[PDB]
Symmetry: C2
Subunit: 707 residues, 2 copies
């Protein structure tokens, strides 16, 4: 009979309910380490037998004898040496290497104050980290650059799979790093209203069609203290992505992407001189090419590497030869409608209407690559023999689930974390020879046990093309009566790189979904064309017209709801954030007779205010696609607003500048339409922490008053 | 049966209704000039006989012979020479002097492009004007100052009656001007969201308790082209106000006010050297002193001048001696609780529980000063003989009305513009010997003739002190039934320098008052203690605690409404702008059991964000009044919000920085209270033009949905 509140359903809530977990669970060679608050256990994967390693009292005793501090829990320890009985942890910025068979502090190192993006190399003992805009290795500064130059940090606004800007050589003798010059990029003025006098907080923001930032790759030698830069030419309008090292540390590889994002090149550079050594492979597509993963060399054969490509329509593994730049190249057409320039023998290791979501690593003894594969609501772990191409089992044996994995040092065992509709969290140890569970580490209990909960249903309907199958999730209140009429709220995202309907826990339902469904509102979400884990054809159907085919598919979802007799067709609302915010506004403006109430958070209004990297991939430039930009500029449709639309924007949003929403307000004032607005001061793109509860109460209140 | 629309009732509306007027009505000596679109007439004041002077066709004929352009109407013509049959007008920035007896162009002058604040001196033919931050006289630049220096323009944020920064000598041979250095004042970042990339639009804004701007007075001679600056010492934390010239042009007078605004000094300076020549008079008050008018010399005796002071509790005329600085000074206590340092014989020309609102000028033959006097809803024109102090008639003969006047060159006749509850606009010529109407120039007809209109009632109730009488205005729908219950909307301002309930047209009702009253809402407004035209005691009751006594008085108004059987006590809303926005928020937070719904526009939230000049006058400094600032900081009461509060703020508001409202939103998020917000981009303190209709539709909609 008791229903959960927003305090129990929204992250940031005082009593937020979540399924039990095993934090810090990792590998020490081929032994599984299960940390706790007071003990660290070792688990033999073959048997599942738990052996105690060390207690926090024991470690703290030795830390106090060294005046090194105190641990509160053992969840943050790491085991980066397969052969040394050593542990690594941090206590107030200080790195401690601890021997757990002798109970001794091996070493301590404290980087300079204000250290971020710390990247430790176990093989050499070197640590790279950043202080403001400059890069540091151990006690020395690698760079001394002015404002506008950023070193050793992420570049190209985290696109093409870039998440860091430091790349240690396999043995830790050289460090590759990014050097970004943003000096020529426009600054957007955010205003801090908590200062004595409201101050400007400028952020570099490159908008579609304007001047971009320039990236350079440096190579630093900690033994000499000298750095070189790769001689790639004028870096203007070029992306330098997916940095990878040769196993011998003599050359560096990267994937270069042009500004039009339709041509990618796998390049080699000399690590000692920075001189180019050739192009091994080239990939082209009339729409776009999007490299997201570096090349991985075979641990048993450095003359071969695995490249990840969607050229046939799905992300798959391809085995290439290292000597490809010095062989005869031929041009080929690819199944995705693109083309590629390839030399040498290339072997497609994985094939089918599914994609590889992660390379987990290798089993060197059995010569296999272990990986995770996905499609729609299905996921699973797999192995493929690199020599013959024999796959462990067909993708068709996959169930609806969400799998995550961590491979042991020998590739013999796997930590398998998964969730299904009714199973919140299951953690098993899995044998990679036959993919059989060897031991259950956790089977989390339902955190909503003893609460009244809504029902969840998933299914498929056809897209606006009449052929593509779209997955939807439908939620109803617990006391649902099919004789009564109910209001509906469509939760929408619908942009690329995301999927709302999963095969995981509650089919991806969010806390607010649960909250509104229990308040008497039917909740609906459909994953339209453009969304992820369905291949490139499903995704690029939206090219140069973002939001259009997405809206058409969302309307097919509504036509399905209207066919249900318990749906009140005159009470359809819509809510989304970011791309979802654009979709909420666009649906209100393009289908004003369908959607009655809408709540749009941090939306994109005009793609001309959006970043170059993401924007120009799907929309090209305002100069190259003037029709696309006009059609998808929601300021042009401001006069179509009939219903209740609330726009929420955060004052320190540097993903969607606040200009989007205020320029939309001005357009409605001029057109004499009446949207509502709300600004969350001191919040970035999303409202985080306790204020996220305030946000969901405000959203709930808007739908209760107007739907 | 037809009701007016917001398009007919709101300025900026497409069909805005207003009472007929006579634009450009002025004096050519003692002849009254009535311009029109096609003709200029002359009116003999004794008789009221209209004589044609000239036609637009005649003037345009002569302008075309001189290639000087074309006039579209004769409303912008001026007659600054009493003895020359000449006119002044401007065609596309070009000044033209025209003789209307001979039909000849006398001269043309075109100032540099981008000219503003043009100040023409008919006696010398010189014109001063500004281009950006610099001052110009005729063809030459007086100043060449960098960013942060402003010359020849208004200073001290238009306080102490400063409305310009150029002051010509009586014969036009010297120009006194302001030079303001703002370089040391903090810049507030406003953001222009119409730019390609949202840009910063900085404004200098000095906040209470912080570093102020510095003002200097320059004296420029157009014949020599040289300037001198008054040697007043370090200008830090001093106000230089009410600049006035000696009749012989040999010295300049000003009133200096300290930063604590409790000590004023009448000062003389040599016009040739800029050297100080003494202090003639000093005025002190424990609360504040506020000089707002320069001294005026008697046209028949330059050894005497009239000073305007509230030292006895009401603004009155005092006759002083020019030789006062060189006489024996004594300190005296004043009836307002202040003190003054005075030398020589001083004569109080006007006395009573009423104030002088304007010195219209003089009748030199009869030795009288003509002036307008006000108190509450009462107004009138008066003469006092400067020699014997005999007043034309007692203030008690005044009726409820709003009078405005323009005196002829000899002070024999007056243009009297007035309004009463039911008379929208009456314009008469009045004989200043007996103040009898000599001719009716206009008796405007009601612009709402043929419309359904609400009823208007005025009365008085006692203030929260139990002794002071407060004027209120009550409006009811036309079909009002005293058997039914009605919702009420309190319109509030309540700050100093303003009065809402007048003796003029509709007792000061505004368009939106009319609109809501006709929609079935009772409208109520009360002029609380702190408001103007009631003397200093009524006003400074709020000193150091702005909003507190004002709220108490607004609540006495509500206790009156609750005593009316046709008022629904459970449906009371409130609306105000600026000080009224503060009042709306404060009333919602301090009396949450009284006001159900509120709409606050461009409010003051924290007095620490408000300007030095106005703020420190009534609140002192945050360091001098920490309790006052804490109590009146509405962020401190954020947790008290129970009802529906909408805060509207304009993104380019440089009166109330947008920081006020955004810092209030943050405080409510933190306190878990739910106010609503709206931002009008590209609007200053008030929404002007067609968007003002959008603003009033949004305000109407908020009250219809929630009250
Ligand atoms: Mg492109
Ligand atoms: Mg003071």
């Amino acid at each position: 009979t008791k229903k959960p509140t927003l305090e129990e359903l929204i992250p940031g809530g005082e009593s937020y309910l979540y399924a039990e977990n095993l934090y810090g669970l990792q590998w020490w060679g081929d032994e599984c380490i299960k940390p706790g608050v007071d003990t660290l256990y070792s688990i033999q994967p073959k048997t599942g037998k738990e052996t105690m390693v060390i207690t926090r009292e024991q470690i703290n005793k030795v830390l106090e004898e060294n005046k090194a501090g105190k641990l509160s829990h053992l969840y943050s320890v790491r085991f980066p040496w397969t052969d040394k009985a050593q542990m690594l942890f941090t206590i107030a910025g200080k790195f401690i290497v601890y021997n757990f068979k002798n109970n001794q502090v091996v070493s301590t190192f404290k980087p300079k104050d204000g250290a971020n993006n710390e990247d430790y190399c176990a093989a050499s003992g070197n640590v790279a980290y950043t202080i403001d805009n400059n890069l540091y290795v151990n006690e020395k500064a690698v760079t001394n650059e002015p404002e506008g130059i950023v070193c050793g940090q992420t570049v190209h606004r985290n696109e093409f799979g870039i998440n860091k800007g430091t790349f240690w050589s396999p043995k830790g003798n050289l460090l590759a790093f990014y050097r970004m010059d943003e000096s020529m990029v426009t600054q957007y003025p955010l205003v801090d209203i908590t200062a004595r006098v409201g101050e400007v907080n400028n952020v570099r923001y490159p908008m579609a069609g304007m001047t971009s930032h320039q990236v350079k790759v440096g190579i630093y030698n900690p033994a000499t203290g000298k750095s070189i830069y790769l001689n790639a030419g004028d870096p203007t309008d070029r992306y330098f992505t997916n940095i990878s090292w040769a196993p011998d540390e003599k050359s560096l590889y990267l994937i270069e992407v042009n500004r039009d994002q339709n041509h990618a090149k796998l390049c080699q550079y000399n690590a000692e001189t920075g001189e180019p050594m050739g192009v091994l492979y080239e990939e082209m597509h009339p729409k776009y090419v999007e490299p997201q993963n570096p090349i991985v060399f075979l641990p048993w054969d450095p003359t071969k590497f695995i490249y990840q490509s969607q050229r046939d329509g799905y992300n798959h593994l391809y085995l290439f030869e290292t000597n490809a730049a010095n062989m005869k190249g031929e041009t080929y057409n690819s199944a995705n409608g693109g083309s590629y320039f390839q030399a040498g023998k290339v072997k497609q290791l994985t094939k089918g209407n599914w994609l590889v979501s992660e390379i987990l690593g290798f089993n060197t003894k059995r010569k296999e690559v272990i990986f995770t594969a996905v499609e729609g609501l299905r996921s699973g772990h797999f192995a493929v023999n690199v020599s013959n191409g024999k796959i462990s089992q067909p993708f068709e044996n996959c169930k609806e689930s969400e799998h995550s994995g961590t491979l042991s040092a020998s590739g013999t065992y796997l930590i398998d974390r998964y969730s299904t509709k009714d199973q919140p969290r299951v953690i098993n140890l899995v044998d990679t020879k036959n993919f059989k569970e060897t031991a259950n580490l956790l089977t989390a209990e339902n955190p909503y046990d003893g609460y009244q909960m809504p029902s969840i249903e998933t299914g498929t309907i056809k897209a606006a093309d009449g052929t593509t199958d779209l997955h939807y999730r439908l939620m109803k209140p617990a006391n649902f009566d099919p004789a009564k009429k109910y209001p509906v709220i469509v939760y929408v995202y619908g942009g690329p790189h995301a999927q709302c309907v999963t095969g995981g826990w509650q089919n991806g339902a969010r806390g607010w979904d649960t909250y509104m469904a229990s308040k008497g509102y039917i909740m609906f979400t459909i994953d339209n064309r453009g969304s992820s884990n369905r291949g490139l054809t499903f995704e690029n159907a939206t090219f140069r017209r973002l939001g259009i085919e997405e809206g058409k598919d969302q309307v097919k979802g509504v036509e399905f709801l209207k066919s249900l007799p318990y749906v009140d067709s005159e009470r359809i609302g819509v809510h989304g954030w970011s791309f979802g915010g654009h979709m909420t506004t666009a649906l209100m403006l393009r289908y004003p007779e369908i959607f009655k109430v809408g709540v749009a958070g941090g939306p994109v209004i005009d793609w001309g205010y959006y970043e170059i990297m993401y924007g120009e991939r799907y929309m090209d430039t305002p100069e190259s696609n003037p029709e696309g930009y006009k059609e998808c500029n929601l300021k042009n449709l401001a006069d179509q607003l009939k219903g209740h639309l609330l726009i929420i924007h955060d004052d320190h949003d540097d993903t969607c500048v606040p200009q989007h929403t205020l320029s939309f307000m001005k357009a409605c004032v001029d057109a004499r339409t009446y949207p509502d607005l709300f600004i969350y001061p001191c919040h970035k793109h999303n409202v985080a922490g306790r204020d996220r509860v305030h946000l969901h109460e405000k959203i709930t209140r808007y739908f209760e008053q107007n739907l």
